[PDB]
């Protein structure tokens, strides 16, 4: 049982820069000083990528502000966030979002992730509902609310669980019937904007899903101090969370590999000529 | 053992506020919610509502909605209680009571009765 | 909103004499994510200010050991006296919490 957290549809999202990000192993192999051409669905260098706020707005303002909408699936996305206390908590996958067709729920508690492909109606607006005390001052159980109904599931998969300080950043693809997700971790320490610098994205894991993904829905967990149970939307903040989302495209990348085996520099062969010149000269200097 | 101080009886002109006061020793106002209530032999007694000091917001009850304003500050463990006109209704004895949260009241000062002329 | 009924509106018994009091409920009171009934009992004397009895039907707390024994279903809740003692003279409320605003029954009165 969901009850509308908010009734605004829509505010007017603000975009970044995504300065090279979203830069992901292509192959399991390791290199050595070597500069390496590979083509593939990579995140365009300096591309717009849409900022999301959920946080609580000052009460001058509407009370509610926070913002979960259903997001297009375009040949894969890159997907990140600056948070602390784990407030962003899974993603929803599918096409519809409805019951008639399939799609994929990766929701990740504090201690394990659950991933399950099957038939689910959804709410409106899907949220881990935790809950707080005062006397104890100690965090309390969850609940799910993210879905009414679930029928015909064909694939569960458990594992280990995957100012500001915290950097998360992954990748979902859909190629060839699986799904890919790249994943990388990295504290870091500007509030408001994304890190200008390198940061390398590793194989996490690929399912054998086999289905059609063309939306997606992020998944954000709500804290609200008081329960009765006759009475719910009403008093839920969503902390201080933001999210980043943008989209791959078939681009051709020339990388760097360090002594130790790590990618440390990457080239966009697109962005302009001297680009260009240096993707076709295969080196980084151009004299 | 908590025990809360109340307003004493009052006597009042009907088509003016009232001011309540409910006060707490043993601990601060932040570590619990507070509950106003107001008492009729006949008629029986009302529920108003909750006002949370932590949140700086206070939610209210339907039939109390209008005609009622609640307020908190932490610097005195004393929580407020107002209305905005006296009416026949509104002239009645009246009480505090402490909420735990995902629990009951706890708590019930003395208590304050209201007798108009 | 939720309406509470209670009876006996009052009954006279003797020391040590068994009693019982109910009141019903036209909703359920039960709550499925915690299957936790939230309803709670009261007991007070003329001029004295209302305090709580144990809820969940767990009425045991501090006082006189096993003072009111009480049983509750989800839309049914009575309270037992095994025994009535004679300086016990008390009025009865019931109270919900499963939705606002928290009920509050007709009253019950037991007498010596």
């Known amino acids: 049982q969901c009850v509308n957290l908010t009734t605004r549809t829509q505010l007017p999202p603000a975009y970044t820069n995504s300065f090279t990000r979203g830069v992901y192993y292509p192959d399991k192999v390791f290199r050595s000083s070597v500069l390496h051409s590979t083509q593939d669905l990579f995140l365009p260098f300096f591309s717009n990528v849409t900022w999301f706020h959920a946080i609580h707005v000052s009460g001058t303002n509407g009370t509610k502000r926070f913002d979960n909408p259903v997001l297009p699936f375009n040949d894969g996305v890159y997907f990140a966030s600056t948070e602390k206390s784990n407030i962003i908590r899974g993603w929803i996958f599918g096409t519809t979002l409805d019951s008639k067709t399939q799609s994929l729920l990766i929701v990740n508690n504090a201690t394990n992730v659950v991933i399950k492909v099957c038939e689910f109606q959804f709410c409106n607006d899907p949220f881990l509902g935790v809950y707080y005390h005062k006397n104890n001052k100690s965090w309390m159980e969850s609940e799910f609310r993210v879905y009414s109904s679930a029928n015909n599931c064909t694939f569960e998969y458990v594992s280990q669980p995957f100012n500001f300080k915290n950097l998360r950043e992954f990748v979902f693809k859909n190629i060839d019937g699986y799904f890919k997700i790249y994943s990388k971790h990295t504290p870091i320490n500007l509030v408001r904007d994304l890190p200008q610098g390198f940061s390398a994205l590793e194989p996490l894991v690929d399912l054998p899903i086999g289905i059609n993904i063309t939306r997606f829905q992020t998944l954000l967990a709500l804290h609200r101090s008081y329960l009765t149970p006759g009475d719910s939307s009403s008093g839920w903040t969503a902390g201080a969370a933001a999210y980043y989302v943008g989209y791959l495209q078939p681009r051709t990348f020339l990388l760097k590999y360090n002594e130790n085996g790590t990618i440390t520099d990457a080239v966009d062969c697109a962005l302009d000529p001297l680009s260009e010149t240096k993707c076709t000269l295969k080196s980084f200097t151009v004299e | 053992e908590v025990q809360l101080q109340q307003s004493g009886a009052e006597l009042v002109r009907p088509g003016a506020l009232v001011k309540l006061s409910c006060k707490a020793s043993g601990f601060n106002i932040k570590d619990y919610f507070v509950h106003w209530v107001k008492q009729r032999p006949v008629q029986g007694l009302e529920w108003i509502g909750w006002?949370?000091?932590?949140?700086?917001?206070?939610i209210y009850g339907p039939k109390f909605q209008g005609k009622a304003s609640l307020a908190a500050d932490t610097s005195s463990n004393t929580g407020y209680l107002q209305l905005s006109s006296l009416t026949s209704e509104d002239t009645a004895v009246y009480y505090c009571?402490?909420?735990?949260?995902?629990?009951?009241?706890?708590?019930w000062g003395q208590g304050t009765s209201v007798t108009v002329s | 909103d939720i309406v509470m009924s209670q009876s006996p509106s009052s009954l006279a018994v003797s020391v040590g004499e068994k009693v019982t009091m109910s009141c019903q409920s036209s909703?359920?009171?039960?709550?499925?994510?915690?299957?936790?009934?939230?309803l709670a009992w009261y007991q007070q004397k003329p001029g004295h200010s209302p305090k709580l009895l144990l809820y969940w039907a767990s009425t045991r707390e501090s006082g006189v050991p096993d003072r009111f024994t009480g049983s509750g279903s989800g839309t049914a809740f009575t309270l037992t006296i095994s025994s009535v003692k004679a300086e016990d003279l008390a009025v009865y409320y019931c109270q919900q919490y499963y939705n606002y605003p928290y009920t509050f029954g007709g009253g019950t009165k037991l007498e010596i």
């Open positions: 006002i949370d000091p932590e949140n700086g917001n206070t």
């Open positions: 009571a402490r909420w735990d949260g995902y629990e009951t009241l706890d708590y």
């Open positions: 909703q359920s009171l039960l709550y499925s994510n915690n299957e936790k009934n939230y």
